Each structure stands twice: as C-alpha cells, then as structure tokens.
C-alpha cells in the first residue's frame, strides 16, 4: 500500500521522461522481447487447435 | 481479316489525337502548345501521313497557306452542322414522304396490340382511337423534319464508310454531295471538314463524327417523343406522358446551347454542366420554404458565375500561342456573354412551366450537346496538388475515429454471432467495459461517451475470418486491358514518338519477360501463363510479395481510369472482395442498388423517416478519396488486418503507391524523355508524369472509405447529440438529422429546422476538416422536405421520373456484336419499355418502339455491313411464306403480322403482351402461345370474352396444329435442361450466341499455354457426355432439381468462363494479338442470323400441316395442357413436372360490376379522386415477394467457413431435400459430400439446414425461379388500391381441397393493379372495383412426386474428376474441429 | 496515503494534458522532391510555428493555423453562414434574370 | 474511498493506452514498409506463424 | 479487494512503457537503427523456428 504506490510513481516518472524524449525528437531489445512473447502466445493458441485434432 | 468500326460512340473524344493530327496537317500548334504537337510535326504517324498526302488535302492546305480559308475548332462546326437548313430541293419532299410512311406504318403495327388489349379489357386501322391519332399525325412539323433529315444524311455517310471499309482496308471516304455545302474527308484515324462559302476548315477525329451523329439522333428522338405525347394528350389527357413540353422552346434551347458552345469553346461544357444546379433551384422554389431555397439560389448563382469566369480565363490562356489565337470572339473580352447566358437560363425556366414533371424530365438537356475533349495531362496536374499536400491532425481525432470503427465492429459481432470478438488485449479495458465484455453486451449511442471511444481504440483482436487458399477464376478474369510492367511501359506509345535509345532498349529488354507479362489484356494475361498455380495469390498475400516491388506503375487514361500490372490488381480485387464478403454485414447503410424499383424502395424508406426538428444534408463524395492518407485509412485497415489474421492486405495502397510513378499512357500523349534515360523512376517530373502520390486512386478501396465515412457519421451524431439516419449509394451521401427541441416564444417550426440544419452543417464541416477533408459549398446542400438520392426525385410520396433521358439512344444497331439482328430488336424493346414502366404511358412506348422496329427491319436490313442484303431476302421469303400460310392479301399485312408475333417462334416481337401487366413469369411458352392467340384474334375475329370455339375461320386451329405436330428429334436432353430449364428441343426454338460459339471457344482454349484451361477444354465434350448420363434414369424429370444438381458441380464454374469468353468479337483471334475479325467468325454469325430469321418457315410448315388431315378442335381446350404436351413431345420425355404454369392474363376474366356470383379477387380504389396518376394513397406499397422455405438452421460457428463452402452446404442440403426418394440416395450423397466438400456424409449432414416444407415443387429457391413478382406500375401508385383474395380460396378448396395448385397469386394482384392503371389510361377515369374470376380449366394440382431410378455414381465421379481444377476448398480437420 | 494518490493524480493529469495537445503531420515528399519524410509528432504550438516558418511545405496555411488553434476562420465562417452573399457577376446575372 | 480513487487511475491509464496505441499504429507508414520494420511495430499474425510452423515440422 | 486493482495498474503501466519503447526506438533517423531492427527480426524468426521444432 506504501511501496506499491511508489513503484507506480517511479513508473509514471519514467513514462513522462520517455514521452518528453519522444515528443521533442521530431528530427531495441525490450521491443523484440515483447514481439517474441506475444508471437509465442499466438503460436500456443495455434498449437492448441493443432493438437485438438 | 476484316475490320469493323464503331457505329455509336463507345469511348472518349481525344484531345491529344486531334491536336497531333491538326498540328501535323497545318504545321503549327493546333489546339495547345503541348509536347504532342512537337513530336507530331517531327515524326508523324503513317496514317496521318496518308491523310495529308491526298489530293484534296493538298489543295486545301495550299488554300490555307494563301490566307484564303480560316481555321477553326470542332465546336464551331458543331454549331454549323446543327443549323444546316439547306434542305430546299426535291430533297424536301422525299424526307417528308419517308417520315410520313414511317409514322403510318408504326401506327398500323400498333393497331393490332391496341385492338387485342381493348378486346380483353372489354372497353388498315380498326380502332377509333388510332384512326383519330392517324388523322392528327398526318403533317410532321418543321423542327422534326429538320433533325430527321440531318440524322439521315450523317447516318448515310457513316454507313457508306463502314461498308466500304469492311470491303477494302485503308479506305478514306471523300464526300461532297451528301450534305450540300460541307466537304468531308472521313477515315478511321481522322476527319477533315471544309465549308466553302464560309471559308472555314477544321480537323477532328472519328469519335467526334460519331458524337455529332449521336447528337442528331438524340434531338430527333426528343422531337419524336414530344410530338407523339402531345398528339396523344390532345385526344385523352391520361394517354400521353406526364410532361407537356412545347417544341419551339426546345428548338430555341438547342440553338442557345450551341451558341454557348461555339462562343466560349470546348471550355463551354464546364458552364452547361453547372445548369443542373439551376434546374434544381427551380425545383426547390416549389418544394422548399423561404430560407433553404434562398440559400440554394444564391449558392447556385455564385457557382455558375465562377464556372463562367474560370472558363473565360482558361480559354484565353490556352489559345495564346497556337494557330487559333484569332478565333476568340469579342463578346468574351467585353463581357457581353452574360446576356447570352441569361437568355439561355430564361428559356429553361420557360420550359419548366413551374411544374415538377417538366422540371424533372428536363434533365435530358445535359445529354443533348455532345461531349468535350478531355485534356489528359491537365486532368493529371489538377489532382497532383491535392494528393501531394501535407495534412495535420490531432491525435484525439484519430483515436476517436478508430474507436467509433471498433465500436461498430463490436456491435456487429454481438448482433450477428452473440459474441464479442476475441480480444488479445482485454488487460487495457476498465471495469465497466470488462463487465460489458464478459456479459456479451454493449451500450447504446445515448450511453456512449467520447472517452469510451478513446478507450476502445486500444483493443487488439484475434483472427475471426479466414482467407481462401485457392483463387476464384471468375473474379480475376474480365474483358479489359492491363498495364505493362515498369520496364515495358514505353510500349504504350507509337514507335515514332519514342527516341532511338528507347526503341533499342525496348527491343533488347523484351527478351527478359514472360509472354504473359508482354500481354496487353487481362484474358490473355491469364491464358498465356504457363506457370499458373491457384495458390499464387494466397502466397503473395501471406508473404507480402507486393511490397517494394520494382514492377509497379500506375497508368492513367481519361473521368480518369487507372490501371497497374496483374499481381497488384489481383491483390486489390481480393482486398475489396474480402471487405464486401465479411465486413459490409456490420454496415447496413452502404448500398450498391441501382435499379428501377430499388431506388424507389430507398426513397420510400427515406420518406418514412415539445417539438422534433428535422433536416437533410446531401453531399457528393466523388473527390472524397484524394484527401485520405495512411494515418486516416490504416487506423481501420489495421483492425481489418487483425480480424483476418493477415498483415497489410487492406493497407496495400498507402504502403505501395507513394513509391510509384504516376504516368499518362495515352497513345498520343507521350512524355519528353531526355536521352540516356530508360528507367521511368528517373524521368523528369512534368505535365502528365509525377511521383510521391499520397491519397489513393479513385475506384480502388472504395468500400473502406465508405465504412470509414459511416463511422465518422456515428462520431458526429455522438458529438452533436442528435439522431442520424444515413445512406450512401456509390458517391452520394444523404443524411437525415432529427433532434428534440423546446420551441421558444414566437419561433416557428421552419426557423427551428433551419437553425438545426445550420448547426449540423457547421458540425459536419468541422468534423470532416478534423481528418483532412475540406468540404466545398459546391458539393453539399441542406433541405428539409424533398427526398433526393442518386438523381431520383420524390416529393410528398410521389415519384418524378426521367424516362426521356434514358430512351435517347434508341436506334438501328444498338448494343450488338457484329450487328446482330435479334439482339438489336431485344435491346430496342427493353429500352423502350421505360416510357411505360416509369413514364406510365403504354401507347406512347408502343408507338415509339414500333417506329424504330419498323425503321430497323424494313429500311436498314438492306444495308448490313457484313451481310449485304441476304437478310432482307430471307425476310422477304419469310413474308411470302406467312402470306401463303395465313391467306393474307399483301406483303404489307404479312409484315404487320410478322412484327406482332413473338420471337420464341421466330417472329420479330421482342415484348410479350404480359409485360404490360406484370414483370415476371414462371413459364415463357404459355405466355408465347397466349400472345399468339391474342394477336391472331385480330385476323380471325375471335372474341376474348367468350371461350375457345371452333369457327369457320381456321387460322388459329391451323397455327395450334402446326405447333403441336412435328418430328421428334431430341439430343442431349439433360445437360440442356440443366443449363436452361425452359429449353424446348427438337429445334423448336431459336438459338443464342453462346450455344453457337461454345465449340469454337473450347477449341481455341484447347491450345492455351495455361494447363488449367487446356485440360478443361480438352475434357469438355466427354464431361458433357457424362453429365448427360448422370441423371438420366430418374424418370420424373424436374428441370429445377436438375439445375440444382448442375450448380453443385465444378462444370458450372468451368462453363461460366466459356460463356464469358464467347461474348467477344473474333473469338478465333484471341491469342493472335490482332484487332481484326476472322472470316470464320463472320460466316458463323451470318449463318446463325439467316437460320434464326427463317425459323418461322420450319415452325409453320405449309406441308399440309405435316400431312395432318386431322385439325385441332378447340371445344374444351386447355392452353396449359397444350403447353405441357408441346414441351414433353420436344424432348421425347414421358413426364416433366414443375415447369408449366398457367397465364394470369389468360386465366382471369375481368368484371367491373359486382354480381351474385361472388368469385375471384377484388381490387378497390381507396382514393377519392377520379384520377390517380401522380397521387398517393393510404395503403402500403405492393411488393410481390414470394414465399420461401421454412427451414431450421443448425448451431455451429459459421465464420470458420468461407462463402463458397457455405454455398456448397446449402446446395447439398437442397439436394438432400429434393431427391430424398431415389433408390441409392445414400451413395449419391456420400459421393457428393466427399467429392465436393471433403467430409463424409455423416459429418456433413450435421451442417445441413433441415427443411420443414414438404412440397418442394411449390417453395424451392433456385436461380431459375423468380424471387418476386412486381407489377408494371411504379411503387408509389400501388398505394392507391386495396385488394382482397379471400373470395377465391372458398372455391379453390371445394374443387381440390387443402392441396397445392400451380398458380401465382402475386401475379394475380399485379395483374389487377396494372389493370386499374391501364383502364384509367384508356378511359380517363379510374374504376371503383374490379373482380378477377379464374378459369378452372387452367388450374392443376401441384404434388411432390415420388422419384424412381438409380443415379449413375461412375459418371458422377467422372464429372468430378475431369473438372477437378474448379472445385472449392475442402473442409479441413483443423476447420471441422473449430466448427464446434 | 492520499498524499501519494495526489502525486499520482497530478502525474496522470500532466500526461493526459500533454497527450491532448499532440499534432501529427502526415508523411509526404521531402524538400526538393526526392524521397518520402516520416510522419511527424509534436506539440500544438511548435507545429503551428513550424507551419508559419514554412518548414513544412503546404498550401492553405491560414486555415491550418486557424484549425490547429480552436478558432474559426472567416472563409469557413461564411461557408456555413446564415445568408449567402452574391458576387459582382452574380448580381449582374441576377439583375438580368429579374 | 481507496477503491473509488483507484477506479479512476485505471480509466486514465486506459485513455493513455488508447492514445498511445493509435499513435503506434499511425507511425508505421509507407517509410516503415520501405525500410522493412513495420512487422516489428504491428505484430506477427496467424498466417506468418502458420507458415513458420509448416516450415518447422 | 485492493491487490487486484493494483495488479491491473501494474499490467497497464507495463503496457504503456512497452508502447513508448516501440515509439521511441522506431523514431531513430539513422539507417543503422532500422537495419538492426530487421536483422534482429530475421534472427527472431529462425530462432522461433528452433523452439517450435524442439517440442
Ligand atoms: C450543389 N449541388 C447541386 O446543385 C446538386 C443537386 C442537383 N444535381 C443533379 C444533377 N443531375 C440530376 C439528374 N438526372 C439531378 Cl436529379 C440532380 C446537381 C448538383 C447537387 C447534388 C449533390 Br449529390 C451534392 C451537391 C449538389
């Protein structure tokens, strides 16, 4: 109740930092991790049906 | 190899062609100062060189260089031609006598049908009406003789040229005497016109001459129709059309439009196009109230004056440095053109007469002045600014657009599948939305907030629909042209217009492409593909082989038509097909319904839509696409991609086109290529060539933008707090807006409606500008109380048509291939039915049809381009045979009879008599026999109120005896009844072009390099043999069940392609790269035409009626039993069930006074006025919808199957329903289910709908049975009458009792309604009641038969195996697992 | 603990306020017409003054300024106005018609 | 009161998520397809994974 | 309960940071970054085939 809200606050601070960095810059591994994770979770849905045969 | 040229304009008039020809001939910039004139004078084409080297052209050029003649522009000579009145000779008598003869013959032909109708209703000329009309039409007026003479002259010139060019290739017509004053040098590649006493000369093209002839024909048709209608309305006010034009004003209108076209220039069409708005203003001044109509009037004036100022500016700019610099009139510089314009507009108002009928019919004026020359590079440059512009959006706008789209999709899934779509992102939803998700519900628009859409825009989906794995050959194959690859684009231009390095490059680089890549048409693009595979499109889409492809171009041809190579066109077609198949079910506002009654349906359902203020907004979405970008289209294309499990299939356009060069590939408009440059993406950007196109090509991706517009309308309705009812039909958006308001003190309903309209318009403008679409005051208007949609006008529930606009091009050889006689007759008849279906005039339509049928048969057969006069000799021998058989007195009477008997028996009447009362019928042979009986009553004096009697006049007995007596000669009974359940057999009916060209098409296809076509065409004949052998032992023949069996096999799809290919000219030269016709095709067509003309000699033999001393007795004769016997005897079959149906026009006797008999249907008039045309009543509009089957649908997941599989399942279910009595039904169904669907019968039976209807003879849904039975009157009028069919079920249950009978009650009601209409037309007073009493001699039982016999399983397997390349996708194990 | 919920709410409000003033410029051709440019995101005033300095090439910049600012230009104000005003040629033609 | 104050942070985070996802989707345009990085920004869908599975087993 | 309402917030925050990482990585002008992305995706595909073929 006391630590969790502070984790939320730190993540919001980092969010504001990256959002400034994005919106003022008019002129990779985390992204690949997320891509791989969700591609694996879609392949799992495919495998469930492939094994249900 | 013969060359047949056009007789009507089918194409565009080219600016660049005329520019190049005139620039080479006169040695200077003719129309513009383009690159076209420079390359034309540098390196002219060989046809231009041929035209310039003639002996008369050299003389005229010498005269021009000496300053003795002045050069002009084609609009000047159009104005000169349309006022040609040097018709003062012994030429003035011949034209008048010819027109008088045509009119007299048309009335004499119409007399027979008028007599028959007046006899049936109980109401050389035998009718008093037509005798008065003939007395009234004895002197044609001068304005009609003018246009008839002009059309005759121009048509003679064209016929002479076409005949002499068929006989000799490379023929130039040099004419000086046909049209006194003018000198024509006509050809296929140009036209030179010279006027000697005015000292004028012009150069134009062949299509411009065709346009001039079409103009003269259109004005002749207008004058004919208005003269006939005026003469009809002078005898009886209900007899003619609803319009009342005066032809002096119409002549003045033609003159002033020609003056506007001659005064400004080619640029003058832009002005006349604006006058449509002017007419709309004159309509609103009648229907709308002060504020709306004042707003529209001021906006219209502004639009017209802006158009005129822009026209003057562009005209003065274009002709500055050309050879036409001294052709600009002085009335343009000093501004005195306005006076002219004013007079024009005044005449239009004087022509309107302050009447909605005149003002609605007056829209023919915009098809009277011709067509402009379309400048191509300029049309390309006009949109380059709109599609290269940068757009700025707020992120909230895109979020809310995506959220509204996702809301529409969620709501559609919940309504259609009782299930939220599968989300992969439900973490992002809040609690109140998670409740909706897990309860499988959604909130309404009144409970929806703008934050909810931003929350919804974050959802991601799983695959819900599946892509087909094998290509459908019916959707990718058509009869159009295709774009070359990017390296072979320079083959779009003549070799003379290309530099030497480009020619060398083309010849050295055509050696590295396939034979299908070097193709210039779609059909041969597919036929020449020797590496074709049906899983090519699926692999292209899944692998994204269309992204970053170096073979991609966009080629424009003007109104612009764009094309690309074949792969990208495949991807485009597939994307639009998937949208039409899977998504348009969630957007019921998107329509594609263009039709006679469908538009009336839409306008009716639109009219059905402390105060409730209302308004309507009309918007034009033609230029809607140029404003779209990736950011605005693909936020929804992404949702569709996720729903189909693919990537960038619906986003292909804005990801591929920005990297392509857009080029104009007109033949006469090449670009300037700098030397040492061969690649197209390296050529300098110029007029007619550019890059970096953002925005989308017109026509491609239209459905995406339609559903996005609908989502934006939902967003606007949310933001504005009012109710919206929207309709989009193509490129026309209509919005009805409603809002509850509390009226102030003294405020009127009108002011509240106006305030609502203004605020809604502000909100619409702002919400459209938020996504980068800037609406103009020329594309949008507001109103309150007039229903307008797709150029169709309704007011107070009454519909106002524009028939004259659609009957403008009726003529000799319209809409045919190789000048077919039968198709031309059919098209004339079908085009003239519109003066009766919409115009509500039987007799005007009839007389116009007879005028042009007589002209086409008795005057234009002698002048056939390929069949010089053989068809006329055939006609004369048929007339002699008819005169001998029926004991007539002349060949004139013989032709009057020939023109009145149906085309089924070999006659020349394209319109059967039942179509004046109802539109559909279930049996053509009975209608043909009844029509023949009614027509022959004219000569035999039989009365159509008594019964069939034997009299001393035995013409009808002779006719019926020759109909039922002939020599049986059947051949291929079952496959023929499969492809047409109404066929006769034993050569008892006329043949059509498909049956004639089938074998030629298959032998041409047997040699195609594509194996999918070669094997099919090589197995065609044995497949036909097997298909005839399949269902031959099932003895009770049901041709509709045979049709159902036929449609469930791959030979159906194989035959679609052949029927499509057999509709081209020169079928033999498909793979020969030639535009000429082979003599074999001409011989085939000629012999077909001759056989079809002389059919009436074989059907009605003089041979003692085929040695039949027995004559037919008519005492107690049933026409429907005779029809059934005739149909069975021609196929040598014992019993054929479910095809014969009585005729309502023959079965029903018509009474007007009520009697104690108390029988038949009753039709009463609920209106209180004596007349009904142009009124509305308190009843519901009659739509004769038929009763389909009652069936229960099994419960499974349907979106797991495609559409072909869901269609095959319904077909197999109908087969299980119908042929459930045969002796080996289990093996039959097992074979079908395992051959076509891939599953066994036990597993497939779980997806079959179960039919609760017992009598399939009565309720079966096949493509060969009519689905609805409307009347021959407009819908708005059906509301004036009330019907009851109860007194007939009391007599039909004592004679049969609880049994099904063969009769359509829908057609009975339609007959009654059209009968009311026609009696009002002919008597000038509508009757109060009519009673229809049936003849029970014609009604029979309809009980489902018990089938006996065995189906041949071996032949079924042979048919399935020989055409295996057209089978649909099998249902997999992975798919059948998810089905449950 | 509300003293921390307040600092969470202020941060959420700041993020939602800086996300409701973002402006997106569509992708298009570069300067001197060679290549395509990416889509650009940036705060409202920065984008407006980038339009003024014509660093982003476009026509009709006045309505762009007046629409990125929640304001109504006079062109669009008469497009949706109560009454329509004629032109000199329009009044000439209207006098000729009456 | 803590739950009623936590049921608003969620509705603000959901709006932030919607806006940021719309931005992610609108930023993967023709230049991303030209450079070949668009599938790293939109995700791999059923058809590619099925092709990978068919070429794996 | 409160622990679930905090778990939801944690999940949403992680999703937001993921979206922001995507947006900021994809917005790199030099060609090096966009070449690294496609090389990493090349790798990922034929490393996913490994885990698929294993089981
Ligand atoms: C400003 N504005 C107009 O003046 C009109 C209305 C009248 N209209 C026609 C044209 N042809 C026919 C025919 N047949 C008919 Cl029946 C009406 C032309 C354009 C119009 C239509 C649409 Br959608 C959108 C805006 C406008």
Numbering used by the authors:
A (entry chain E): 131 to 157, 174 to 199
B (entry chain A): 11 to 133, 184 to 618, 627 to 677, 690 to 1460
C (entry chain B): 131 to 228
D (entry chain C): 130 to 186
E (entry chain D): 130 to 184
What text does the study give?
RSV polymerase (RSVpol) is a protein complex consisting of the large protein (L) harboring the RdRp, polyribonucleotidyl transferase (PRNTase) or capping, and methyltransferase (MTase) activities, along with four phosphoproteins (P). RSV P protein acts as a crucial component to control the efficiency of L, interacting with nucleocapsid (N), and guiding the newly synthesized RNA into the L active site during transcription and replication.
To gain a comprehensive understanding of the interaction between 22 and RSVpol, we conducted a detailed structural analysis of RSV L+P complexed with compound 22 using cryo-EM. Subsequent analysis allowed us to model the RSV RdRp and capping domains, as well as four partial P proteins. Within the map, we observed a distinct density corresponding to compound 22, situated within a novel binding site adjacent to the palm subdomain of RdRp. This binding site featured a deep hydrophobic pocket located in close proximity to motif E (comprising residues Met866-Asn876), which formed a β hairpin connecting the palm domain to the thumb domain of the polymerase. Hydrophobic interactions involved T-shaped Pi–Pi stacking of the indoline ring with Tyr861, as well as halogen bonding between the sidechain carbonyl oxygen atom of Asn812, a component of the conserved catalytic motif (Gly810-Asp811-Asn812 [GDN]), and the bromo atom. When superimposing the compound 22-bound RSVpol onto Apo RSVpol, a notable difference was observed in the RdRp domain of the RSV L protein: the supporting helix and supporting loop, which are missing in the Apo structure due to their flexibility, became clearly defined.
